[PDB]
Structure formats: C-alpha cells, structure tokens
Amino acid sequence: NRLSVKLPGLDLKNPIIPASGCFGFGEEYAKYYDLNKLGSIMVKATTLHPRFGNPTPRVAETASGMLNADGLQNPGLEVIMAEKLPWLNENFPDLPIIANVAGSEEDDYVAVCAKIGDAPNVKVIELNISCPNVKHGGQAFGTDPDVAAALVKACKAVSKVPLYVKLSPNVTDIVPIAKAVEAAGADGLTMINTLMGVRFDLKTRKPVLANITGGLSGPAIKPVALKLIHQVAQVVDIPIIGMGGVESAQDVLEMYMAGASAVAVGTANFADPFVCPKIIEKLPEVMDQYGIDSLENLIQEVKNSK
Amino acid sequence: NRLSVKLPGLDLKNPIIPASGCFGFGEEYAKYYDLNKLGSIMVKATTLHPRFGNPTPRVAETASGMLNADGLQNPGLEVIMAEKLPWLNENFPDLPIIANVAGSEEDDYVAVCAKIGDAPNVKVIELNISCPNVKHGGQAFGTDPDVAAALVKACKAVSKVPLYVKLSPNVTDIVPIAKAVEAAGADGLTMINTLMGVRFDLKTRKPVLANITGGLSGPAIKPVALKLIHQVAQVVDIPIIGMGGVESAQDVLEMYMAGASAVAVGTANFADPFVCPKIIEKLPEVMDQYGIDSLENLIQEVKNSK
Amino acid sequence: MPKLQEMMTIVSQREVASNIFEMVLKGELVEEMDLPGQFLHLAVPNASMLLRRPISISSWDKVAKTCTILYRIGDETSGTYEISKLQSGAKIDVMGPLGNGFPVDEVVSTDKILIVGGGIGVPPLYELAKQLEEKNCQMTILLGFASEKVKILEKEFAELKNVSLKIATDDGSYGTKGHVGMLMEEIDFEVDALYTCGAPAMLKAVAKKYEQLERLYISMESRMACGIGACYACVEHDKEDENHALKVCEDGPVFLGKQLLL
Amino acid sequence: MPKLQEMMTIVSQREVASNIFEMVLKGELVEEMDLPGQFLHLAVPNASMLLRRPISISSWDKVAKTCTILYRIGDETSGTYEISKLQSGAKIDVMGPLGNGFPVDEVVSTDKILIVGGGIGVPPLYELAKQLEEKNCQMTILLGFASEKVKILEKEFAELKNVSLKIATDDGSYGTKGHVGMLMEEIDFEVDALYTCGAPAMLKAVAKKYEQLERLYISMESRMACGIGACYACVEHDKEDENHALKVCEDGPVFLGKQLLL
Ligand SMILES: Cc1cc2nc3c(=O)[nH]c(=O)nc-3n(C[C@H](O)[C@H](O)[C@H](O)COP(=O)(O)OP(=O)(O)OC[C@H]3O[C@@H](n4cnc5c(N)ncnc54)[C@H](O)[C@@H]3O)c2cc1C
Ligand SMILES: Cc1cc2nc3c(=O)[nH]c(=O)nc-3n(C[C@H](O)[C@H](O)[C@H](O)COP(=O)(O)OP(=O)(O)OC[C@H]3O[C@@H](n4cnc5c(N)ncnc54)[C@H](O)[C@@H]3O)c2cc1C
Ligand SMILES: Cc1cc2nc3c(=O)[nH]c(=O)nc-3n(C[C@H](O)[C@H](O)[C@H](O)COP(=O)(O)O)c2cc1C
Ligand SMILES: Cc1cc2nc3c(=O)[nH]c(=O)nc-3n(C[C@H](O)[C@H](O)[C@H](O)COP(=O)(O)O)c2cc1C
Ligand code: FES
Ligand code: FES
Ligand SMILES: [Cl-]
Ligand SMILES: [Cl-]
Ligand SMILES: [Cl-]
Ligand SMILES: [Cl-]
C-alpha cells in the first residue's frame, strides 16, 4: 500500500519498527496488540554470551526524555537462537526481524553474525557499534572509522543476511564513520543510538544511575537525530532507518524529510504501549494533510531533493 | 551570604548568571526587574566587527527545548565598548559583567580580548570557541585541543581580566580539549554551549531554520550538560560555570553535584522572564530541603567527593 | 507599576471558524492596553513546549477587564491546539501587552482610512477600526480569506458605522472571488493612511501599490522566542538604514512602509 | 477481552497526610483486579515527564467500579506533585493492573497471618487484609512510620475484625517509639504466612527474622520504565537461580523470600 516500503532484506507492510532494547523480543508487547501490525522489530541486543547487565538503578527520567544504562542485558546467542527467535517465528512467521548484534571484541561480533542469520525470521542484522572495545582501550567501535570499517568487513564476511550498522551520535564528525562503513560493505544504516547523560540525586549527591552515565533517548533527542540523519544522507547512497524521539506520524514524516526510509520507535513505547499501531493507523490521514501519496515516492522525491 | 560564591574575577552575591545570547546586554530584561538581583551577566557575544547574523527563520521549538541559529548578531566591539557596556556600568555599576568573545580567526579573538577588559564593569572574558575557523577549513576552534590551546594562550597574552573558556558538547571526547585549555592558562571554564539539531517543515519538506542546522538548548540538554560537566570536573582544577537546561533551584543544585561553582541560565528566560530572580529567592528553601548550609561549602564538599 | 505578566482567566473560548478559536481573557493586563496592534506572548499548557505563542490582541474592554483574541490552531501536535483545550475558568500564562501598535492619535475626521486584512492578520484590525470610529473618520475595510470556511469577524466589522466593508475569498465561496489585492486595485479615492496585516504576499502587494504613501502601517509576523527584543530571533532588515536590524517583537510588530523591504 | 489501559476518572482526591494523597479512580480496569498487591502505571499530566509512575492499588470496589491509591508526592518539580493537582472529574492515563500480587487462595481460617508494613509500602496491604478477613483468619498487623505526620490508613485497618493492630513511629509522635522491626522481635506465636511491604531496611529485617519461613511474601520497589517486562529496568538477582534476573514489574512486585537477596 502507501505505507509499504522495500529495503535490503525487508519488504515491509509499513515502516514502523520498535527500536532495539525497547521491545524485548516481543513477548510482552504482544499481550497488547497483534505484532503483525508492525513492519518489523529490532529485538534486544544479542551478545555471544549471556549478560546480566549493569546494576540498578538503571533508568531515570529527564525533560522529554529518559536515561538508561541496562548494559545490554540479554540471554546470549544460544538461548536467543533456541527460544527468543523461534517464539517470534512460530507466533509471527511473516514478521521480519532485525537482530541487533553487540559485542566486546571483534571475534564476538563475528561469531554472532555467522550464526544468527540461520534463524528463518531474521532478515537483517543491525550491527551495534556503540560498544566498548576491550582490544582498543574501551573505545566504542563506532567512534573510529578504521576500527568500524574493519568490524563491518569482518562481520560482512559471515552474514547470510544484509548487514545494517547503527551509528552513535557521540562523535565530533559522523561523516567519516558513515562513509567508511558503507565502503566496508554495509547494506544500510540505522541512526541514531543514544546520547550520553547524567542525573544527580540531590539528597545523596551521587548519580541516579549506578553506571553514573546513561543513554539519553526520547523526543528530547529528535532534533539531534534529524541533524545527523540529514547530514549522513548527503554522503551515502545506502538507505537509513531513522530513530530518536519518534512519537507521532508527524515525527515519522519528518524522519523522511531528513532522508530516512523507515522509522524505528523506542522510548515512546514506555509511555504508550499502543504508540506503534496508533502511528501506523494515523499515517495515511497525516500524509493526506501534507499531500504525500506514498512513502516509497516520498523517499525518491527526497533522495532527488537531493 | 549562603548564596555568595567567589570565582576568579567574580565576587558574586549569588551564582545565577543569565547565559550569553539569552539576555542581550540587559536592556530589555531590566524592564522586568532590578538586574542587581543577578550575580552576574553573560552578555551577547562580541565580535570585532558588526554582524547582522543569519537569515530568518532563526528559531524553532523542540520537545523541552529550542533550536537557534542567529549567527552571533552583535553591533561589534566599538559599539559594545561605547554603548552597551557603559549603559550597564551606569545603571548597574556594581554588577560584574562577563563578556562573551567570539571570532572567525585568531587575530579577531585577540583584538577583542585586548580591548574589552578596559570596560570597568567587565570582570571576566568568556572565550566562545564554538566558532568556525576560516584559517582551518571551517573547524570550530573548540574541537581540536591544539587549535584551542593556541587560541587561549594568544588571548591570554592580552587580557587584563581572567579568561574563561566556553566548551562545546559536540565532541567525541571533551577531556583533551579541557586539559589543553587549562594548560594554556584558562582561569576557568563554562559549559556547555548548544548541541546541534534540525527541524523539518512537513509542508515545504525543507528545514525550518534558514541555516538548516541550529543550536539545541533547554531542559532537553541538561542530562548531556551534567554528564560533560561531571566528566570535566574530574580532570581540571579550575572552576566551572555550568549551564544547559537550567530552570529551577533544583537544577542549580544538581549543577553543583556535577562540579559547577556557579550556574548560567539561558533558554528559561524566554518562557519565564522572572526565572532568574525566582530561582535566586527559592534557592535557600531548596537548600534547606537537602541540608546544604552554603553554596561555598557545597563546592568544597563536592570537590573533595571528589 | 506595569504588570508585564499575568495568569489571566479565560472567560470563554469557542470555535468561530474552521480551526479558529475566539478566547476572552480577563485580567489586569487589559488596563495597560492602548494602541491597537499590540500582542500577547502565550505559554502553551504543555511543559515540553517552552516558547510562548505570539497572538494579536483583537479587541478589549477596559471596564470588563477583558481582552479578546482570535487564533488559528495547528494539528494535534501543535501548541495552539493545546491552548484550545483550555476551558472557561482556566488560567493562561500571559506576558504583555507587547510591541509597537498601530498609531491613531494623528487620525482626524477629515481623513479617509483604508484597511487591508487577510487570514489571521485580521483580528488586530478590529480594535483598530473600533478606535478609529470614535475619530469620526470614514473607513473602507477590505478583508480576504482562503475560504468561507475561515472567514472571521465579518459581523463585528459590519456593525461599525462609517465603514464600507468588502470581503473576498480565494475560492469564491463568499463575497468576491479572488484575493484582497484585487479589491485594492479598484480603490477610487485618495487614502491618507493605510493599515494592513496579513500574509506576506498580500503585505507585498499593498506596499507596492502605496509605496509613495507615508502613513502606511504594516503589521509583521515572525518566528519569536524571548518576545521582548533580547534574543534577536525576529529580525527584519531596516530598509531606510542598511547595516541595521529591526526586531519585529519590539520595534514592531507594526512598521512604516518605508522601514520595510517587500 | 482485558482492557490493559484506560483513561480513568478521578472520583476524588484529598491530602490525607503530609504530602500523601488518596485518589479514587473509576473505570473498567477495576473489573480485572484480583490479587492484592498489583499496581497501576500512571502517566503524569506533564508532557515533559514521559515515564509512568508505578503506584500500588490500595483497595477496590468492584460494584462501585472504583479503586483507591495512596501516594506520596515530591517537590514542585516532581511528577507525583503534578498528579496531585488533578481535580475531581479529571481523567488520568492508567495502564493496569500489573504484576504478580499477594496470593491469598491457600490461606485458611486456622492460619495466623502476620503483616508488616512501613511508610508508603502500607497502601497495598489494606486490600490484602480486606481479603484475608473473609477467610476468617486471625491477623496481626504491624505498621511503622517516620512520624505521626505521615501515618496513613490506621482507621481503615482498625475497622477490620480479626485484626490486632500495633503502630510505631520512629520519633514516638504516635503509638510505639521506634521501627516496626522492634514490634516484630516481640512476636509470640508461630506465623504461617507473612506479607510485608516497605522500605528496604525493613524488608531486610523481616527477611532475616523469618528466613526459614516459606510462605513469606515480600513486595519490592524499583525504578521502572516500560512497566511490563520488556525494557529490563527493574531487575533483581534471583537468589535461588544465580545466572537469572527477576523483573520487579512482571515477576513481582511480590516475591517469595527465598527468591530474594536481602
Ligand atoms: C506579532 C504576531 C502576532 C500574531 N497574531 C496572531 C493572531 O492574532 N492570530 C493567529 O492565529 N496567529 C497569530 N500569529 C501567528 C501565531 O503566533 C502562529 O500561528 C502560532 O505561533 C503557531 O504556533 P502553533 O502552536 O500553531 O504551531 P507549532 O508548530 O506547535 O509551533 C512551533 C513553533 O513555531 C512557531 N511558529 C510557527 N508558525 C508560526 C507563524 N506563522 N508565526 C509565528 N510563529 C510561528 C510557534 O510559535 C512555535 O514557537 C501572530 C504571530 C506574530 C509574530
Ligand atoms: C511496584 C511499585 C509500587 C509502588 N507503590 C507506591 C504507593 O502505593 N504509594 C507510593 O507513594 N509510592 C509507591 N511507589 C513509589 C513511587 O512509584 C515513587 O515514589 C514515585 O514514582 C516517585 O516519583 P515522583 O514523581 O515523586 O518523583 P520524580 O523525581 O519526578 O521521578 C523521577 C523518576 O524516578 C522514579 N522514581 C523516583 N523514586 C522512586 C521510587 N522510590 N520508586 C520507584 N520509582 C521512583 C519516578 O517514577 C520517575 O520515573 C511504588 C513503586 C513501585 C516500583
Ligand atoms: C532501555 C533501552 C534499551 C536500549 N537497548 C538498546 C540495545 O540493546 N541495542 C541498541 O542498539 N540500542 C538500544 N537502545 C537505543 C534505542 O534503540 C534507540 O536507538 C534510542 O533509544 C533512540 O530512540 P528513541 O528515542 O525512540 O528511544 C536502547 C534504548 C533504551 C531506552
Ligand atoms: C538565542 C540564543 C543565543 C545564544 N547566543 C550565544 C552567544 O552569542 N554566545 C555563546 O557563547 N552562547 C550562546 N548561546 C548558548 C547559551 O548561552 C547556552 O550556552 C546554551 O543555550 C545552553 O543553555 P540553556 O539551555 O540554559 O539555554 C545562545 C543560546 C540561545 C538559545
Ligand atoms: S523575539 Fe527575541 S528579539 Fe524578537
Ligand atoms: S519496567 Fe521494563 S522490565 Fe520492569
Ligand atoms: Cl558476550
Ligand atoms: Cl567579526
Ligand atoms: Cl470588572
Ligand atoms: Cl457503578
């Protein structure tokens, strides 16, 4: 239909995708609506081994946003291949799944990328490079173009599905990293991951988060997301799934004006569990309001804008 | 009193300072209350020559924030020495003024720093290094530690008043820049300047701002500000005037927990013209609530926290 | 002595045209109002929307302690939309009144006044005509709208004596089909003062047809932040003084035609 | 068939103790309530505060279609403060009811039940006692507070038959001076099931004194985000299964004492 969009590895009925780490592996939000309404799902990060994650408190509220520092808690590859992904395949066999892949060192990233494409419902791997690198001094794989390009090319060597890369906003210049990752064979990009923030408790005078720092998400970060998506779209020809503060069909369309081809929705699910289906159903009315016939056309019109 | 705080060049009756670019040179907000209530004022940026600034639209609203791209509109050094600063000296001779200094190339920064200390009410120069450098490819003087250290040391050579440096949050790692600038002789720091954001108009499909990108300010950016202030405070021994999203006496105290010694207040003035005096008067009640006797003690307790 | 800011009380609020609400506000800010064409800087009742909404004062009643505004709302993500949910009895956070308004002191019974309004530029012109009626002068008032669906204040203007009122709609749904500028071109007298407020293309047409008139007052709009002249968000180039910036919120919103470029 | 979310109507709301409000909510969500100790996930009426506030259900009335909550507010920057400004007739955005509550099915008239509450952990224990009273069992209920200034629900608990109620205050302003844990140490019978909810130090004391009891139910609190088990914000370590994380919002909020570490 009008909402349908086609991306490498993804023939989506609509462009609305719950963002990784905000939907689990679907089992809880499924209690609230038929997940088939979604275009896709970015499931919680997969690491090679299980991770309990960071100590609590893990979250904090901010003005039009939140902080989070769960630390990529997940049951690990085996359990995700055996339990989490099969449950989604059984209950929603036609719903394509984007597997968010994280790690502490390159070998770990590669091992997950070799295996997780085997799951039939997994159509795309989302490479999360905002992770501290224990072979590089704790350096997030995504702040250095050469590190990032190496990681991408290595994982590209073993993926049986198209490989997207999730870019971090915490850089002086995102253009070198984006260029390098496309050159290393990335089929697409997703952006953005969280900003870094801190809250202090006035009584204890200590940080609210046990991790001290946390990732800043929510509508507060949408202007930064649009800036970086727009910046990157002028510099690469692979498509972009945009995210950061999306809350409404208006926000979705604004993501398109920036150069995104589909839109992920994260923090909004916590305020409103129905936000993703609500956005999906109000998209055609809102597209009418601004004279947009189809999302596929809008992508090409904007791509030629240019 | 309890609110009094002493910084290089600043014996402040309280730590509340309207942020540069959000108070003009005081003449308009003075219509609403006695500016003597303030601790200080960061006046609009001074460049060597007049600047009309960027085309309109210059501002846009965001979730718990705003975008702004005025482009450092100011009447230039001569007019600011002859009109703007003397008016503040006549009407508020005891109110210390922080002169925000910007420029396109180092010689321009130096020339302003040589002259503006002559004004009797100017007690501190706030070096704004978030400016595009036309001798470096448009590179903001504040994203490269060596560029920044050179600029600071050059301006340090001619300033008759203590020199503070305003740091930009748009960097991968703010610690090298902060270290280098302290080493170059900076008496103090102020942080943070704005993040970069973009809004799109859904009807025109073009950016809302004529400049496309704009600076993102307001409560939305407070978690990022606290993160960077906290990060820098562990790495330098010169004091910090913290700013970014401050709206309440609570926010002021939270800035102190991060390591600030005084707090600038910017975007909040546009929503509430009385916000700075309101914060000043509710600070003692709020300090009571969290068992803080004086702001000077709190600074030392936090500095030893460490 | 001036109040500057006040939590006013909304007396009533009703949708008088498609997505256009008329709100009556009661407060002590009304006692400070003088020139037509000043504005109020309204805080949206939504804590994620920090910039005030600038809205023209359409009329006031000093005895009633009330003022009246008419504003168009956006979609459900807009702040004006939030404002329209406020009910009779609610408080609204007002700064004002603000700006340089339309001057009327030098208007006298001999003069023939022309008024050109369009869209949501129309509200402030009502208090203008209301005041000029006391000076026993003869006014022609030309108002244009996109559609009958958004026509406003026809009845209020019609009940004013010494007023010829012609109304255009772009689609022809009401009155004359076309734009106000057309009804301008048909003017057959010597106008001594012209007051105009509306969409940029209309303001441009008026400014060329009467470029040689000196008493030509143009009410401008702009994106705004501080609303008081501090932040420099709302600058126009000064036509008579290149190398100088006019601030719509504080120098205006009303300017002499010679001060403006298109 | 389950509603999951509902714009409930606040029936009333009044400050029943220093910064503690009792709100009555009317909606179809009440028909889905069963176990005591479930909670509601409340949206703050402030668009800059996006995380819902988790608040225990204190009591409900299926015929009235009402539930009752008692919550403490923070300062004027807190969201609970905003919630307390809601007036009779306003709507409030509720998700719920949520979580694993206190089980009562296996309680029988023979059993002697102990209940230990503190502070704002007390509200959910009221609906618990209310339900246990029907099972004709004999309860001792020990409640502790910082001060008389924050004592809540004494009268409601007192009007319950089969209930011995002792009340402590840390300062001695009311009842027994000291903490609940002291009144625990004085227990002189064999308790078959203990239900407790309150501040961590208190939960810890209860958990040691009755570490050997199996029917020991502890209601936990945590920072929360999604409120349904998706986001992993609210994890406790599983004591009986190291290498496993319990989620307070979905596995709890009520746990068996053997599942918890301190
Ligand atoms: C001096 C002055 C007087 C005005 N008088 C009236 C009046 O009497 N009636 C009326 O309907 N409108 C009037 N306007 C226009 C009115 O301020 C805007 O229509 C309104 O602010 C749009 O906000 P929103 O909440 O609908 O949209 P949002 O999209 O939620 O607003 C986003 C931001 O953009 C700003 N903005 C967007 N469009 C405009 C615009 N066209 N002009 C100014 N700011 C804008 C908003 O103030 C806000 O800061 C006036 C504008 C000015 C400058
Ligand atoms: C399962 C459960 C049931 C609860 N039942 C009750 C009850 O019946 N009565 C009652 O008074 N309180 C109860 N609480 C505690 C209540 O949720 C917090 O006191 C409240 O969320 C604090 O928010 P605020 O608006 O006052 O402060 P703000 O500082 O504005 O909140 C900031 C953020 O921190 C969170 N937060 C801060 N302190 C706490 C805390 N102690 N627990 C959980 N979240 C916190 C808030 O939810 C919000 O996300 C319960 C908590 C949980 C987890
Ligand atoms: C609780 C939480 C957990 C997250 N976990 C992950 C993750 O595991 N992997 C990942 O790539 N991004 C993760 N993110 C980032 C989001 O997917 C998204 O990139 C970011 O939050 C911005 O989108 P939003 O503002 O719509 O939430 C997480 C965000 C939150 C709030
Ligand atoms: C309209 C506007 C103009 C500004 N102008 C300047 C400036 O001229 N020089 C400068 O160093 N910072 C400037 N800033 C940045 C603010 O001083 C402050 O560093 C930033 O806005 C964050 O604080 P806030 O969130 O409290 O506004 C400006 C900000 C705004 C919104
Ligand atoms: S709005 Fe700030 S100067 Fe006009
Ligand atoms: S709050 Fe999200 S998992 Fe418990
Ligand atoms: Cl791992
Ligand atoms: Cl210059
Ligand atoms: Cl009256
Ligand atoms: Cl009923």
PDB file of N, CA and C and ligand atoms in Angstrom, chain B residues 60-61, chain C residues 39 44 49 51-57 70-74 77-81 120 123-124 220-224 248 253, ligand 1:
ATOM      1  N   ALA B  60      13.308  27.656  16.394  1.00  0.00           N
ATOM      2  CA  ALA B  60      12.283  26.630  16.262  1.00  0.00           C
ATOM      3  C   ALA B  60      12.085  25.997  17.625  1.00  0.00           C
ATOM      4  N   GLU B  61      10.872  25.530  17.882  1.00  0.00           N
ATOM      5  CA  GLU B  61      10.617  24.844  19.138  1.00  0.00           C
ATOM      6  C   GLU B  61      10.931  23.350  19.015  1.00  0.00           C
TER       7      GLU B  61
ATOM      8  N   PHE C  39       0.456  42.779  21.049  1.00  0.00           N
ATOM      9  CA  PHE C  39       0.239  41.337  21.127  1.00  0.00           C
ATOM     10  C   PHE C  39       0.508  40.820  22.533  1.00  0.00           C
ATOM     11  N   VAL C  44       2.044  27.898  26.187  1.00  0.00           N
ATOM     12  CA  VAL C  44       1.235  26.707  25.895  1.00  0.00           C
ATOM     13  C   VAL C  44       1.094  25.875  27.164  1.00  0.00           C
ATOM     14  N   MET C  49       6.749  22.329  25.576  1.00  0.00           N
ATOM     15  CA  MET C  49       6.640  23.391  24.572  1.00  0.00           C
ATOM     16  C   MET C  49       6.934  24.734  25.248  1.00  0.00           C
ATOM     17  N   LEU C  51       8.450  27.721  24.206  1.00  0.00           N
ATOM     18  CA  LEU C  51       8.345  29.035  23.591  1.00  0.00           C
ATOM     19  C   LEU C  51       6.904  29.539  23.640  1.00  0.00           C
ATOM     20  N   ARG C  52       6.749  30.806  23.998  1.00  0.00           N
ATOM     21  CA  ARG C  52       5.418  31.388  24.049  1.00  0.00           C
ATOM     22  C   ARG C  52       4.875  31.628  22.640  1.00  0.00           C
ATOM     23  N   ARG C  53       3.547  31.604  22.534  1.00  0.00           N
ATOM     24  CA  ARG C  53       2.878  31.789  21.261  1.00  0.00           C
ATOM     25  C   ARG C  53       2.474  33.248  21.132  1.00  0.00           C
ATOM     26  N   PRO C  54       2.964  33.969  20.120  1.00  0.00           N
ATOM     27  CA  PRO C  54       2.606  35.389  19.945  1.00  0.00           C
ATOM     28  C   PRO C  54       1.283  35.530  19.193  1.00  0.00           C
ATOM     29  N   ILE C  55       0.325  36.229  19.806  1.00  0.00           N
ATOM     30  CA  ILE C  55      -1.042  36.328  19.299  1.00  0.00           C
ATOM     31  C   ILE C  55      -1.530  37.770  19.430  1.00  0.00           C
ATOM     32  N   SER C  56      -2.056  38.333  18.333  1.00  0.00           N
ATOM     33  CA  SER C  56      -2.559  39.712  18.324  1.00  0.00           C
ATOM     34  C   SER C  56      -3.763  39.900  19.250  1.00  0.00           C
ATOM     35  N   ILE C  57      -3.790  41.035  19.955  1.00  0.00           N
ATOM     36  CA  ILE C  57      -4.982  41.465  20.683  1.00  0.00           C
ATOM     37  C   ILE C  57      -6.025  41.913  19.666  1.00  0.00           C
ATOM     38  N   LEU C  70      -8.277  36.012  18.584  1.00  0.00           N
ATOM     39  CA  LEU C  70      -8.749  35.000  17.645  1.00  0.00           C
ATOM     40  C   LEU C  70      -7.511  34.365  17.050  1.00  0.00           C
ATOM     41  N   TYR C  71      -7.374  33.049  17.199  1.00  0.00           N
ATOM     42  CA  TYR C  71      -6.157  32.382  16.756  1.00  0.00           C
ATOM     43  C   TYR C  71      -6.496  31.084  16.034  1.00  0.00           C
ATOM     44  N   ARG C  72      -5.682  30.759  15.047  1.00  0.00           N
ATOM     45  CA  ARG C  72      -5.802  29.504  14.323  1.00  0.00           C
ATOM     46  C   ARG C  72      -4.949  28.418  14.981  1.00  0.00           C
ATOM     47  N   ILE C  73      -5.471  27.196  15.039  1.00  0.00           N
ATOM     48  CA  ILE C  73      -4.737  26.096  15.658  1.00  0.00           C
ATOM     49  C   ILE C  73      -4.123  25.224  14.566  1.00  0.00           C
ATOM     50  N   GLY C  74      -3.053  24.512  14.921  1.00  0.00           N
ATOM     51  CA  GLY C  74      -2.436  23.524  14.055  1.00  0.00           C
ATOM     52  C   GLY C  74      -3.017  22.152  14.313  1.00  0.00           C
ATOM     53  N   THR C  77      -0.360  17.929  17.331  1.00  0.00           N
ATOM     54  CA  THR C  77       0.975  18.104  17.900  1.00  0.00           C
ATOM     55  C   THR C  77       1.336  19.566  18.138  1.00  0.00           C
ATOM     56  N   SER C  78       0.489  20.507  17.729  1.00  0.00           N
ATOM     57  CA  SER C  78       0.768  21.936  17.859  1.00  0.00           C
ATOM     58  C   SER C  78       0.409  22.443  19.261  1.00  0.00           C
ATOM     59  N   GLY C  79       1.004  23.573  19.637  1.00  0.00           N
ATOM     60  CA  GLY C  79       0.719  24.173  20.931  1.00  0.00           C
ATOM     61  C   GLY C  79      -0.596  24.935  20.976  1.00  0.00           C
ATOM     62  N   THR C  80      -0.938  25.611  19.875  1.00  0.00           N
ATOM     63  CA  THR C  80      -2.217  26.302  19.798  1.00  0.00           C
ATOM     64  C   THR C  80      -3.363  25.327  20.015  1.00  0.00           C
ATOM     65  N   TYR C  81      -3.223  24.113  19.475  1.00  0.00           N
ATOM     66  CA  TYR C  81      -4.187  23.048  19.724  1.00  0.00           C
ATOM     67  C   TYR C  81      -4.354  22.804  21.220  1.00  0.00           C
ATOM     68  N   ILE C 120      -5.441  35.321   9.298  1.00  0.00           N
ATOM     69  CA  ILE C 120      -5.330  35.537  10.740  1.00  0.00           C
ATOM     70  C   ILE C 120      -4.606  36.847  11.039  1.00  0.00           C
ATOM     71  N   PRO C 123      -7.584  39.813  13.069  1.00  0.00           N
ATOM     72  CA  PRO C 123      -8.029  40.165  14.468  1.00  0.00           C
ATOM     73  C   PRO C 123      -7.566  41.532  14.961  1.00  0.00           C
ATOM     74  N   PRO C 124      -6.273  41.892  14.851  1.00  0.00           N
ATOM     75  CA  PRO C 124      -5.836  43.180  15.450  1.00  0.00           C
ATOM     76  C   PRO C 124      -6.451  44.408  14.787  1.00  0.00           C
ATOM     77  N   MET C 220       3.716  43.023  10.986  1.00  0.00           N
ATOM     78  CA  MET C 220       4.557  41.923  10.531  1.00  0.00           C
ATOM     79  C   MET C 220       4.412  40.721  11.460  1.00  0.00           C
ATOM     80  N   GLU C 221       4.756  39.546  10.943  1.00  0.00           N
ATOM     81  CA  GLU C 221       4.895  38.367  11.787  1.00  0.00           C
ATOM     82  C   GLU C 221       6.281  37.764  11.608  1.00  0.00           C
ATOM     83  N   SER C 222       6.678  36.956  12.588  1.00  0.00           N
ATOM     84  CA  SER C 222       7.995  36.341  12.582  1.00  0.00           C
ATOM     85  C   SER C 222       8.004  35.190  13.575  1.00  0.00           C
ATOM     86  N   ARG C 223       8.961  34.279  13.401  1.00  0.00           N
ATOM     87  CA  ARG C 223       9.264  33.340  14.471  1.00  0.00           C
ATOM     88  C   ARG C 223       9.869  34.107  15.648  1.00  0.00           C
ATOM     89  N   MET C 224       9.468  33.750  16.862  1.00  0.00           N
ATOM     90  CA  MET C 224       9.861  34.503  18.044  1.00  0.00           C
ATOM     91  C   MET C 224      10.314  33.558  19.152  1.00  0.00           C
ATOM     92  N   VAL C 248      10.982  42.520  15.015  1.00  0.00           N
ATOM     93  CA  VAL C 248       9.526  42.520  14.885  1.00  0.00           C
ATOM     94  C   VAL C 248       8.840  42.627  16.246  1.00  0.00           C
ATOM     95  N   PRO C 253       5.266  45.029  16.476  1.00  0.00           N
ATOM     96  CA  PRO C 253       5.057  44.403  15.163  1.00  0.00           C
ATOM     97  C   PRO C 253       4.659  45.326  14.005  1.00  0.00           C
TER      98      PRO C 253
HETATM   99  C1  LIG E   1       3.271  39.504  16.380  1.00  0.00           C
HETATM  100  C2  LIG E   1       2.462  38.292  15.989  1.00  0.00           C
HETATM  101  C3  LIG E   1       1.067  38.325  16.126  1.00  0.00           C
HETATM  102  C4  LIG E   1       0.294  37.227  15.759  1.00  0.00           C
HETATM  103  N1  LIG E   1      -1.048  37.274  15.900  1.00  0.00           N
HETATM  104  C5  LIG E   1      -1.803  36.201  15.559  1.00  0.00           C
HETATM  105  C6  LIG E   1      -3.278  36.169  15.680  1.00  0.00           C
HETATM  106  O1  LIG E   1      -3.892  37.155  16.110  1.00  0.00           O
HETATM  107  N2  LIG E   1      -3.928  35.057  15.322  1.00  0.00           N
HETATM  108  C7  LIG E   1      -3.286  33.970  14.844  1.00  0.00           C
HETATM  109  O2  LIG E   1      -3.920  32.943  14.518  1.00  0.00           O
HETATM  110  N3  LIG E   1      -1.949  33.933  14.693  1.00  0.00           N
HETATM  111  C8  LIG E   1      -1.182  34.971  15.034  1.00  0.00           C
HETATM  112  N4  LIG E   1       0.191  34.888  14.878  1.00  0.00           N
HETATM  113  C9  LIG E   1       0.768  33.648  14.362  1.00  0.00           C
HETATM  114  C10 LIG E   1       0.909  32.676  15.533  1.00  0.00           C
HETATM  115  O3  LIG E   1       1.843  33.150  16.527  1.00  0.00           O
HETATM  116  C11 LIG E   1       1.316  31.321  14.986  1.00  0.00           C
HETATM  117  O4  LIG E   1       0.303  30.881  14.094  1.00  0.00           O
HETATM  118  C12 LIG E   1       1.487  30.297  16.093  1.00  0.00           C
HETATM  119  O5  LIG E   1       2.540  30.718  16.961  1.00  0.00           O
HETATM  120  C13 LIG E   1       1.766  28.898  15.535  1.00  0.00           C
HETATM  121  O6  LIG E   1       2.016  28.011  16.633  1.00  0.00           O
HETATM  122  P1  LIG E   1       1.390  26.543  16.708  1.00  0.00           P
HETATM  123  O7  LIG E   1       1.270  26.210  18.166  1.00  0.00           O
HETATM  124  O8  LIG E   1       0.131  26.552  15.882  1.00  0.00           O
HETATM  125  O9  LIG E   1       2.376  25.569  15.912  1.00  0.00           O
HETATM  126  P2  LIG E   1       3.677  24.750  16.380  1.00  0.00           P
HETATM  127  O10 LIG E   1       4.182  24.139  15.088  1.00  0.00           O
HETATM  128  O11 LIG E   1       3.406  23.881  17.596  1.00  0.00           O
HETATM  129  O12 LIG E   1       4.744  25.904  16.749  1.00  0.00           O
HETATM  130  C14 LIG E   1       6.154  25.674  16.630  1.00  0.00           C
HETATM  131  C15 LIG E   1       6.939  26.959  16.846  1.00  0.00           C
HETATM  132  O13 LIG E   1       6.917  27.709  15.634  1.00  0.00           O
HETATM  133  C16 LIG E   1       6.299  28.977  15.868  1.00  0.00           C
HETATM  134  N5  LIG E   1       5.538  29.355  14.652  1.00  0.00           N
HETATM  135  C17 LIG E   1       5.100  28.510  13.697  1.00  0.00           C
HETATM  136  N6  LIG E   1       4.456  29.176  12.704  1.00  0.00           N
HETATM  137  C18 LIG E   1       4.479  30.480  13.019  1.00  0.00           C
HETATM  138  C19 LIG E   1       3.966  31.720  12.397  1.00  0.00           C
HETATM  139  N7  LIG E   1       3.306  31.683  11.215  1.00  0.00           N
HETATM  140  N8  LIG E   1       4.195  32.880  13.057  1.00  0.00           N
HETATM  141  C20 LIG E   1       4.869  32.908  14.229  1.00  0.00           C
HETATM  142  N9  LIG E   1       5.365  31.820  14.854  1.00  0.00           N
HETATM  143  C21 LIG E   1       5.197  30.594  14.304  1.00  0.00           C
HETATM  144  C22 LIG E   1       5.457  28.799  17.118  1.00  0.00           C
HETATM  145  O14 LIG E   1       5.283  29.997  17.871  1.00  0.00           O
HETATM  146  C23 LIG E   1       6.317  27.847  17.906  1.00  0.00           C
HETATM  147  O15 LIG E   1       7.363  28.591  18.538  1.00  0.00           O
HETATM  148  C24 LIG E   1       0.971  36.002  15.234  1.00  0.00           C
HETATM  149  C25 LIG E   1       2.360  35.963  15.098  1.00  0.00           C
HETATM  150  C26 LIG E   1       3.137  37.063  15.462  1.00  0.00           C
HETATM  151  C27 LIG E   1       4.641  37.002  15.308  1.00  0.00           C
END
